[PDB]
Amino acid sequence: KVFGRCELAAAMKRHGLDNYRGYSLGNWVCAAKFESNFNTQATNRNTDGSTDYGILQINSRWWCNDGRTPGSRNLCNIPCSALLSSDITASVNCAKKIVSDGNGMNAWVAWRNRCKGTDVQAWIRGCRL
Q: Which domains does the chain have, with CATH numbers?
A: 1-129 (1.10.530.10)
Method: X-ray
Among 55, 54, 2, smallest CA distance to 28 is for: 55
DSSP letter string, the chain: -B--HHHHHHHHHHTT-TTBTTB-HHHHHHHHHHHHTTBTT-EEE-TTS-EEETTTTEETTTT-B-S--TT---TT-SBGGGGGSSSTHHHHHHHHHHHTTSSGGGGSHHHHHHTTTS-GGGGGTT---
Of 18, 35, 48, 66, the active-site residue reads: 35
Contact 60, 52 (CB under 8 A): yes
52 is catalytic: yes
| Residue 102 to residues 36, 67, 75, 80, Cα–Cα distance (Å) | 23, 26, 14, 22
Q: Which of 18, 48, 52, 119 is catalytic?
A: 52
Mark whether 35 is an active-site residue.
yes
101 is in an annotated binding site: yes
Resolution (A): 1.8
